[PDB]
Each structure stands twice: as structure tokens, then as C-alpha cells.
């Protein structure tokens, strides 16, 4: 039940975008907006 | 993600103000 | 971008000396007398701190939020 959350550009507020939506921020109005980091396992070798 | 209260966040009263 | 942890050539830890070295230069020490007050003798280790250019101070100007 995960709604594909984005982060605005100029606002830095998480929005919920499902498909068939306009990409706009729920506030201030911004057409550029980015995605959140993954939830998978990030493991590096300090190398 | 519908009501994640877990109670709550200290509900303010009406007769408290 | 940010001070390397070690001197590339030698192995010596120079990561803890960038703030101390900018503070000594702010005080009055000349730049060659600051580098040995910190304890950097080999000229391999001394170019880490002379040549370092600190870009992370400019990259921190681009705030994500506030």
C-alpha cells in the first residue's frame, strides 16, 4: 500500500504521487521533484 | 499508512484553553 | 573537497589538522611555521595541507532545506 513518495525541489516536502497524476508539489507549486533513497541494503567496503 | 497513532500526540482539550 | 584523512605518500594522519592549521594562520603564524607547529616534517605531508583547497565549504552553500 505504498504510494510512491517524491520530494519536491524548492519545497523539500514529501508528496504522494500515484500514477496518472500531475507532478506538482502539494504546496508552492513546483514541477521538478526527485525521488527518495531506496530501502534496500546498501553495504560498502570501506575500501 | 492510514492512522499511525500508536495514545496519540497529546490531544489538547477544549476546557483547557 | 575535504581534507584527506591520510597523506597519500606517507600514511600519516592529516585529517585532524585542517582546522588547527587554519586557526594558526588566523592567529599570526606564517604558513611555514604553522606546518611544523602541527608536527608535519616531511614535505610529502606538508603539501597535503598547503595545496588543499576546501570545496566542501562551497558545496555547503547549496542548502537542500533551509
Amino acid at each position: 500500500q505504498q504510494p510512491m513518495i517524491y520530494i519536491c525541489g524548492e519545497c523539500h516536502t514529501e508528496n504522494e504521487i500515484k500514477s496518472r497524476d500531475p507532478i506538482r508539489c502539494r504546496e508552492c507549486g513546483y514541477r521538478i521533484m526527485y525521488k527518495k533513497r531506496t530501502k534496500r541494503l546498501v553495504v560498502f567496503d570501506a575500501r | 499508512t492510514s492512522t499511525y497513532g500508536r495514545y496519540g500526540s497529546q490531544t489538547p482539550m477544549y476546557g483547557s484553553g | 573537497m575535504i581534507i584527506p584523512v591520510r597523506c597519500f605518500t606517507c600514511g600519516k594522519i592529516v585529517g585532524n589538522k585542517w582546522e588547527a592549521y587554519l586557526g594558526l594562520l588566523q592567529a599570526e603564524y606564517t604558513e611555514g611555521d604553522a606546518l611544523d607547529a602541527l608536527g608535519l616534517k616531511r614535505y610529502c605531508c606538508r603539501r597535503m595541507l598547503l595545496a588543499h583547497v576546501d570545496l566542501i565549504e562551497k558545496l555547503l552553500n547549496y542548502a537542500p532545506l533551509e
Binding site: 500515484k18 496518472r20 497524476d21 500531475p22 506538482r24 508539489c25 502539494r26 504546496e27 508552492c28 507549486g29 | 492510514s2 492512522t3 499511525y4 497513532g5 495514545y7 496519540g8 500526540s9 490531544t11 489538547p12 482539550m13 477544549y14 476546557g15 483547557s16 | -
Partner: protein, 139 residues
């Protein structure tokens, strides 16, 4: 039963999503909220109309200056959106509301009405915002 009554019980975490969604006077009007009076006593008031206060108050991150026309049987007054409780309908408050409704002359809303009212919320949640609601929302 105070258990079926909790399905249409509006908690605090659900109003924040619909502070600016329209049709508001059509989904919330008919449900019951757990409003606060104050010391831990509560009364089941009736969401009657959608009013607005001249007091803008912040609810966590969000802020909302609107009011709620609530009424416990006969005692009706204005209400703000911060004093509502996430607590479900207890037994003493359910019987207290039952006695305030039997005491007022108001008919108890038939259970089929609650069953047809609780689905309005779930359809309003999965609603695709394809029309010009984003724009008025940002405004």
C-alpha cells in the same frame, strides 16, 4: 454498539489529509468524532456543518483555522480541529451519547446509514485527483 460506531469515528490523522479537499461538507457530515471537553471525560458530538474560525492554529506540521459545527444532543457550539481524540468510542461515552440523543428527541441514525456512510470515506481516500483540485489546494 460502540464498535460499529467507531468505523465512522473520525480520528485526528485523517482530517489532516482533507483540510483542503473539497466535497468536505458531504463526506464528514454524518460521522461522529471524539472531541475533547476536559478531565479525561469526552462526549460524542455530531458533525453538523463546516464552519471556519478566525483563529489559525497549527496541527503538527499542518495548520488549519476552520471550525466544526458539533453538537452533543442539544449542547452545540463551535469547535476546532485540535481537540479531537484518536480514541475510539468507549462504552461509557457511547451510552452517554445514547442518553444525550434519547434525552434530546433526536432519532438514533439507523445502522444501515452508518454502513452506507463509512464507505464514503474509503472512496474519498482512493479518489484520483485528475481535476483542478491541486490548484485550489496550493492556493
Amino acid at each position: 454498539l460502540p464498535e460499529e460506531l467507531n468505523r465512522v469515528r473520525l480520528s485526528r490523522h485523517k482530517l489532516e489529509r482533507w483540510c483542503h479537499m473539497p466535497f468536505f461538507a458531504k463526506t464528514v457530515t454524518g460521522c461522529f468524532v471524539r472531541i475533547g471537553i476536559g478531565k479525561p471525560v469526552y462526549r460524542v458530538a455530531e458533525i453538523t456543518g463546516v464552519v471556519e474560525t478566525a483563529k489559525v492554529y497549527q496541527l503538527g506540521g499542518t495548520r488549519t483555522n476552520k471550525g466544526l459545527q458539533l453538537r452533543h444532543g442539544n449542547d452545540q457550539r463551535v469547535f476546532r480541529l485540535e481537540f479531537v481524540s484518536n480514541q475510539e468510542f468507549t462504552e461509557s461515552e457511547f451510552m452517554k451519547w445514547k442518553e444525550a440523543m434519547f434525552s434530546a428527541g433526536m432519532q438514533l441514525p439507523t445502522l444501515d446509514e452508518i454502513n452506507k456512510k463509512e464507505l464514503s470515506i474509503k472512496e474519498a481516500l482512493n479518489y484520483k485527483f485528475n481535476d483542478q483540485d491541486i490548484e485550489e489546494i496550493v492556493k
